[PDB]
Amino acid sequence: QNHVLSLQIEFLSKQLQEISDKLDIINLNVLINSTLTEITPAYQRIKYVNEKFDELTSEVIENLNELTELAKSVTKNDMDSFEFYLQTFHDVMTGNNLFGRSALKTASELITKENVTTRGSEIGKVYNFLIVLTSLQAKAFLTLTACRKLLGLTDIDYTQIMNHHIDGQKREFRINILPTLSNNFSNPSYSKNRGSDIDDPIVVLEAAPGYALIGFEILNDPLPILKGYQARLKPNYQVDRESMSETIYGDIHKLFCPKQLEQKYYIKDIEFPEGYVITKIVFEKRLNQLGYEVTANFYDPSTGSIDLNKVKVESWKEKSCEEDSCEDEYSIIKAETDGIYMPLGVVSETFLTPIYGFGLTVDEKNQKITLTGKSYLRESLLETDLLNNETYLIASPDGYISSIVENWNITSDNTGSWRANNNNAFVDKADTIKGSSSLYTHKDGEFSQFIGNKLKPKTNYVIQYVIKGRPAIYLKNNKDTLFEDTKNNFSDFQTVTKKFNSGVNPSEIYFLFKNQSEYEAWGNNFIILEIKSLEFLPQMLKPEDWIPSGNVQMKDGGRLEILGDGYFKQFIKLENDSTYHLRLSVKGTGRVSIIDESKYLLFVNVKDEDLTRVIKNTSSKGECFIALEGTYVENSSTIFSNVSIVKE
Amino acid sequence: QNHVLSLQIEFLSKQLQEISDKLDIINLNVLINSTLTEITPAYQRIKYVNEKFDELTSEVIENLNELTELAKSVTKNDMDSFEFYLQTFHDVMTGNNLFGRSALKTASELITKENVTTRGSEIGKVYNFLIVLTSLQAKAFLTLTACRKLLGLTDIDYTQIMNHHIDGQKREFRINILPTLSNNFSNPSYSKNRGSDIDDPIVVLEAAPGYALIGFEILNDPLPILKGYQARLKPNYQVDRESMSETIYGDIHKLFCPKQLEQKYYIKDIEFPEGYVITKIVFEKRLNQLGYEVTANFYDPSTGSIDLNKVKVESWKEKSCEEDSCEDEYSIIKAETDGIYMPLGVVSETFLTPIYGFGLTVDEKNQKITLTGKSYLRESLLETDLLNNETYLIASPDGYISSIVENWNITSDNTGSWRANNNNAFVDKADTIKGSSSLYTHKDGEFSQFIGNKLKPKTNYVIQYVIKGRPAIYLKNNKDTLFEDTKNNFSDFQTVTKKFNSGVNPSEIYFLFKNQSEYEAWGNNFIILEIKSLEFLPQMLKPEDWIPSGNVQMKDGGRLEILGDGYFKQFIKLENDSTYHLRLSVKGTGRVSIIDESKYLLFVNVKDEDLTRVIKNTSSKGECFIALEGTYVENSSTIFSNVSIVKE
Amino acid sequence: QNHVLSLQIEFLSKQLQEISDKLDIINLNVLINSTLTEITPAYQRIKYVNEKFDELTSEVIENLNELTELAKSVTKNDMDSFEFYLQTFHDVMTGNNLFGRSALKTASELITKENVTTRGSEIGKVYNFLIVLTSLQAKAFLTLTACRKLLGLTDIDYTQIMNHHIDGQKREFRINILPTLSNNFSNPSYSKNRGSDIDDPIVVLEAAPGYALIGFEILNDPLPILKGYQARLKPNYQVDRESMSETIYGDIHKLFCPKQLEQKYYIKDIEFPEGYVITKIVFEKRLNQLGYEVTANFYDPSTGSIDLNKVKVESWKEKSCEEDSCEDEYSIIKAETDGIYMPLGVVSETFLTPIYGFGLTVDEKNQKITLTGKSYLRESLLETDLLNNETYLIASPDGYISSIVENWNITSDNTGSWRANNNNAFVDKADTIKGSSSLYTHKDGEFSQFIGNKLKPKTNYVIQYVIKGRPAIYLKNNKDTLFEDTKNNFSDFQTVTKKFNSGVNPSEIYFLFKNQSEYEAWGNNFIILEIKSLEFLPQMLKPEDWIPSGNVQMKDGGRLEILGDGYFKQFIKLENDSTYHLRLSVKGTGRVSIIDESKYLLFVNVKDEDLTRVIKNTSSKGECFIALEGTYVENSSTIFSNVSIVKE
């Protein structure tokens, strides 16, 4: 009963903590209400004046008169003038109020609390809040200069006042707000997909010797796949806009998700000292023990050059290695059925930036995977924008940046390698809207483009395309349309991704973006790229030493289909002190037999399942062969998939 | 003492929950204060401009000049213009603020908390909040066009801007607000009226063939009464107006409230898959066991046309699927001496829709008898106004819509049912000048209307009507009056909700609304409808085989008077393995008799009270009957009340 | 230890209650912030316009031009006009906002919480809040009419709009706010003074047969004294302005405060039915058992007549009498030394009103006295102002309303019975300020007034006077200045109260408000009235049956000073079955002796103390005499004060 009272008191202490959190949210909302009462009339007026003067700071007589009257209202020297609202906005931003509170402080406190589903860090969110307000004021001073010029009044030079206002606010942020926080983020969201276990996958993300890795990306709309970003770096941990890349990878769910068997994920914030940039991250999943490799070459921060010889390496992935180099302290996961919470979305920073540290922080208690990096972000922005230089600051990549299709983002009214094969297939910057060219094709239009020369045989490719109407999408080599999408009619530019294995001869594939059989079709942003197939670590089995025994044929995936009476055997050498993870998946019922010479080291029936037999320390006298003797009947088709006796 | 400490800790946990609820109300009020600080100056100005331009968007030189000056102020292109206030209203509504909060979100959070005495659902309340704001903006753009035209300025076409503003707000509602709610509904209040335990009230709530039942309603002012509605079901789970109707049942306190004996309440959440619409409910209270058999039919969501072939009947049998004691899944309400808190008011859904589920949700902790059905309203709207096609929306009613009196209130200028017998006894207003439509009689006044052909012998009818001044209500055939009220001179149009029993031969009873005196009279809203006499489950007592034995005769209420001495006798075969329950009250000191050929299976006298007898194994030797006798007093005519020998 | 845990949990439950109270205060402050955000810009502008147009709605050309320009701004038909601010003020008051909250509701919730040191009830405070806002709007419509007339514009008749606004707000108050509360208040504050115990005080507060008691008052600046209010009543529990009175009483601390001995204060809400008005309240303190008497004659509410024969009486004061008429259930107080928390301030309602009920709710746990009345206030205001008739509504009396000095509030530049005896003693409406005449007398001024004819011998009088400068205050009969105040110089009209026993001949006392010896003097509000001396209940001792025995003399207070060798004896009759509270206080050491004939029923020495010997049931054979034999020496002066052998 005293134990029951203790549990009830622990329940009360939890309720009091939830109450104390609710109070901290309420107190903050009260401080937001104070700053809104101070800043809202100025913010709303500045916004309206900035929006209504967009063309001039970027019917003729009517709008010019309607704007001239507004300009007279704006430049008027009243107590309630536009200059009054600009000054009060600056004062509330800095904290020159009745009680010394700043709008930047209450905003920073807000962002720190409501950072629930936020992609980036507290510094980057509070700084983005500062950027939108400084841009609003700068545009407001620009409209005020434009209004004075339009009326023919004298130039007051608001550059000095605007600079004093912007610098004082950046100084308030630097002194009282920024001694904030940390450079660690993760993947945006989680997803449940299925992978593999009898595989030995391995994935490297290495940047060019002049590049550093500038981000990641995982999409699963065609299939779960890792997209890898890297680019040449500019001074002060800045990045060159061109040379940025997105590196599509294999069935990344495989290396991510298990199949009803445990996983080994080591946990450590690999971090090298400053200036060191990780131009390569390997990943290695062998026997479901998924490791990786984070190593950083140095980078001279001042001159955009990454060092090409001063590598720093942490071969292991676990915090136990950070002190002992003994491979332990992973995170073990008992595999859930539907699929592990694989990362979904884009693994990058709001601004592409060299990361110096990275850590794996999977939380198997919820079967959820989480990462943690460490980047030079404070040391990249702290020198250029916070010192107000030529800002080379580029937002994060949401999706695809390029395409195998040239001019895929047709936006300047040009075809390029596209081919305007009709007078309804005219490039038409305003195909359906001048917001973007999206090649117009109505009732006979066709835009063609050779894409096959880049389509290479026995390789999967990704395709996406922003298409209005019912477009005639074609991946055709004039003989075999490796993929065609002429099915959907889209009034609202619906874009989706699929896959296809480039056939034996894709090297002739034209893209033929025609209209349709007949409809009104539009389309741009024809993102097509190559889907990498996942590679795997070695083994002891080989697709060549197999000895077919009649009515048995091997397939493209080394599949060795048992077409009936017969088998494949492979003389493999097994040794006394060595262990062997014999692992294989079958399509169609059958058996597998390791007859050394007379003894059955292994003989089991396989219907459709992942074999995982770990052949223990056993001396195979002479040579043993895994006689892949599937079912022995006419309609027997025992298609193995992964021939792996991979030795422990 | 440890048990006392546990109870004190449970009291602390309740106090902490009340504190956590208070914090959630406070946090919401703080978020309302933020949105008020943002939106109030625009809302107030839009409202004032909309109200002051009503005739123009629906003394002349003065009003025209004052409105022309107002129009010059409204159309003026300042920073503080009417267009500024419209744009800021749109931005605060969508969430384009300093911190990304929308007025629609804080309003939805408000309505979700203060839904205490709200008639309709969260969706319908938040959508009604959206409608009043969108209408306010649309009228504001309309006054702005009217002001430009009045001044003679160029037309700017604000239809495009208004549509963009309205659609963006409806999109915000559809995406970020609407993906919340439930569709339960219950009674608002409760009533205490001593019901029945002597009787077995079974009540059927069945819809017409083309109808489904579309609401409940509980009355106590005329009497404990069940009010009901039923109507055709249109396409899209909406309901046909003109096919609605009313049905009124008797003493439903006797159906729900027990009197001085406990009542069993089969909590039975009868629910059906989608497409099913309740075409029948039976409520079953035998031996105070309030079960209820319900039969819902299926219904084609589109094209209306409830299909009368796919029915389901889950009477009490949701626990039959899991437990032999299907007699479980109930509750126990103990009848205190004033009755039980039967519902009072209305168990219905905000807007008219088929209900699919129903359950019994009594609360004997407060005697709170609560009905609860499951409506299709969520569906009935998510497809209609969310798509903005027809929105055939009718909210739930409150009083009687159906009346035997034709032109029950008045249509207008025409009382074709009534008779304007006198010229001066005209209709007082005749068009919208005296509040609502209402008859009027003065110094001779009368209004005759034949409804005797619509009145049945010996049946209870509930009466409602609204009257002002000096009225003389009459319901007569110029020879006897069924209902009359010519008193209580009142202020303005007060409502009656009472009952009466229709006469023994009312085939000629017509209504004669006259004047109370030589003064002027007013009245309207004459509601007349039948009250279905409460009907009970049959038991082996039938009045015909009664043998009136000695100065006696069969009576009306199933009563069997005993004038002085004598009795009523009738043979009823009791069994030696079955239990019977003789439940009967008397008016006059009586003696009931359960005697065998020699011995007294029961030996009881009844003075003026009921009789609750649970007879154990009734050893039966053939001869079983009851001699419903009184005692040897000349004055007290023994008059039993309710024959019920119900065979357990 | 479990008991210690229970006490700790009770401490936690108290902390949670203090937290829940803090939340209710916070939630209310958040609702006040919402209404302030809605109503503040309108309230401030209405207030400024009302204050700046005061002389017109009550430097010629310059003020007229500045007000004409202001009037042009006020009457201007803009979106931000004065009419806009009036309409928005009305809408926020009624609750026609974005979310349906009314300023009247949040204000009522405020007043209900912050009613800590509030004199009147919740109804009267919330109604006073409604009055100040309705008056603000009415004055605002009035300034708007005045501004239109001043500019020469057409009359718009804002009476209709103003009436609609005022009536709609009074309707909101009547429906949603007023079904509020209760008619019970108490004394405003508490005070620690000292009284008496061996006294038998008794105080009646009876209104004239045409009057009802209209309030109370207790002041203690000269000495703690009760001031009693009563007046003839006007229809609907209204009061005639004249005939109001203030009835000064005795040393009310005496009847209020004990002297180190217990008190008996009975507790009951004496309440008679409606129309019954308490035209008399007796109070009786005998043997420290302080009782009273609250009896109510009827009052025909319609015609201002109190009934003069239909008395209703509750002779006792205790709730035990309200059911048994057995004198018990008092509140007993163990007397504190410094003094009981006697009522300080004015015991009345904010508006003078007939009280029908009254209760004593002393709280001796804090030694604090509290009262509780029940008045017809809702039924007096509910008919006149809430029906908008000629409001005869008079605020509560703070201090004195009249004076024995005629024209005491010299305000119309007239002396009256005052006498301007100098050309520096000129009445001078602007003596020092035209805000009030306050008779000016500089360096020779004198104002004289005969006040002695009303000053009656051997009676105490109260005096107060609002005086600037050093005034020559005189209560002089040209031979003996019974009191004179020529001492203080007051720049700021400092007024104070004192006392004086009118001498053997006060009937000639002139008031001679001269200046001074010489200074600048001012003065008005010469409140002078008669200080009643406290009377007492009877006893068995008598000041006449005393038998002096040489060197002994009686004084004015029946004091019987023992001037040395000698005594007073008084043959008193004591009986067997009777008890006698012999009680007496002495000045100077001495003794008292009750020699019956030979036996010492009582002989004790008395130095300076309250004798309280309760002579028990004792048969005095023949006659006994209390031989007041004080100290027997030359310098013996044993001045007894209260000769009371008052028989139990």
DSSP A204-216: EEE--TTEEEEE-
Show contacts of C149-152: CB within 8 Å, 24+ apart: C150/C56, C150/C67, C150/C68, C150/C71, C151/C68, C151/C71, C151/C72, C151/C75
- Cα C147 from chain centre: 44
Interface test with B, best of C76, C77, C91 (most B CBs within 10 A): C77
The structure's method of determination equals cryo-EM
Cα(B263)–Cα(B333) distance, integer angstroms: 5
Q: Is C26 on the interface with B (CB under 8 A)?
A: yes
**Residue in the structure block whose two tokens are 């040489």:** C550
Alpha helices in A373-482 (DSSP H): 377-384
Nearest to A2 among B2, B26, B154 (CB): B2
Half-sphere exposure of B620 (CA within 13 A, CB side): 17
Tell me the two tokens of residue C617.
């049931």
Determine the number of helices (DSSP H) and then strands (DSSP E) in chain C.
9, 37
- Cβ-based neighbours of A13, under 8 Å, separated by 6 or more: none
Of the candidates C362, C324, C315, C328, which has an alpha carbon nearest to the alpha carbon of residue C343?
Answer: C362
Strand order through the sheet with C584-587: C610-611, C584-587, C639-640
Of the candidates C458, C514, C469, which has an alpha carbon nearest to the alpha carbon of residue C491?
Answer: C469
- State the DSSP code for B507: T
DSSP B323-349: -S-TT-S--EE---TT-EEEEEB----
Q: Contacts of residue B43 in chain C, CB cutoff 8 Å?
A: 98
Of the candidates A74, A42, A250, which has an alpha carbon nearest to the alpha carbon of residue A147?
Answer: A74
Tell me the two tokens of residue A23.
């109070």
> Which residue type sits at C132?
V
Nearest-by-CA chain B residue for A46: B79
Cα(C265)–Cα(C292) distance, integer angstroms: 9
- Cβ-based neighbours of C114, under 8 Å, separated by 6 or more: none
| Chain B nearest CA to A43, separation (Å) | 8
**Residue in the structure block whose two tokens are 């937002």:** A395
Neighboring chains of C (3 or more beta-carbon pairs < 8 A):
B
Q: Is C37 on the interface with B (CB under 8 A)?
A: yes
Angle formed at CA B616 by CA B615 and CA B618, multiple of 5 degrees: 85
Angle formed at CA C470 by CA C464 and CA C471, multiple of 5 degrees: 50
Nearest-by-CA chain C residue for B22: C23
Q: Which of residues 241-300 of B touch C (CB under 8 A)?
A: none
The sign of the torsion formed by the CA atoms of A181, A183, A188, A189 equals negative
Tell me the two tokens of residue A473.
């999408």
Q: Is C65 on the interface with B (CB under 8 A)?
A: no
Nearest to A62 among B17, B79, B154 (CB): B154
Cα(C401)–Cα(C464) distance, integer angstroms: 12
Cα(B631)–Cα(B590) distance, integer angstroms: 6
Half-sphere exposure of B467 (CA within 13 A, CB side): 27
Collapsed DSSP state (helix, strand, coil) of residue B68: helix
Radius of gyration of chain A (CA): 31
- Cα B581 from chain centre: 34
Nearest-by-CA chain B residue for C23: B22
Q: Contacts of residue A25 in chain B, CB cutoff 8 Å?
A: 27
Cα(C325)–Cα(B209) distance, integer angstroms: 72
Of the candidates A250, A249, A252, A248, which has an alpha carbon nearest to the alpha carbon of residue A528?
Answer: A248
Cβ–Cβ below 8 Å for B45 and C80: yes
- State the DSSP code for A534: P
Q: Is C151 on the interface with B (CB under 8 A)?
A: no
- Cα A126 from chain centre: 23
- Cβ-based neighbours of C348, under 8 Å, separated by 6 or more: C214, C215, C216, C217, C229, C396, C397
- Cα A5 from chain centre: 49
**Residue in the structure block whose two tokens are 């850590």:** A359
Nearest to C79 among B11, B25, B82 (CB): B82
Which H or E run contains B137? helix B122-151
Nearest to A49 among B5, B19, B79 (CB): B79
Q: What are phi and psi of C317, to 5 degrees?
A: -125, 5
Q: What are phi and psi of A445, to 5 degrees?
A: -70, 145
**3-state SS record for B613-644:** EECCCCCCCCCCEEEEEECCCCCCCEEECCCC
Beta bridge partners of C611: C584
Q: Is B9 on the interface with C (CB under 8 A)?
A: yes
Cα(C169)–Cα(C173) distance, integer angstroms: 6
**Bridging pattern class, strands C371-375 and B514-515:** unpaired
Are the C-beta atoms of C291 and C285 separated by less than 8 Å? yes
Are the C-beta atoms of A302 and A376 separated by less than 8 Å? no
Are the C-beta atoms of A510 and A450 separated by less than 8 Å? yes
E-strand ranges in C256-393 read 263-266, 269-271, 276-286, 289-299, 306-314, 330-333, 341-344, 355-360, 371-375
Cα(C144)–Cα(C53) distance, integer angstroms: 10
Beta bridge partners of A331: A265
> Which residue type sits at A565?
D
Of the candidates A249, A256, A313, which has an alpha carbon nearest to the alpha carbon of residue A285?
Answer: A256
Residue A27 vs residues B32, B99, B486, C15, C237: alpha-carbon distances, Å:
15, 16, 63, 20, 50
Q: What is the resolution of this structure in A?
A: 4.8
- Cα A289 from chain centre: 24
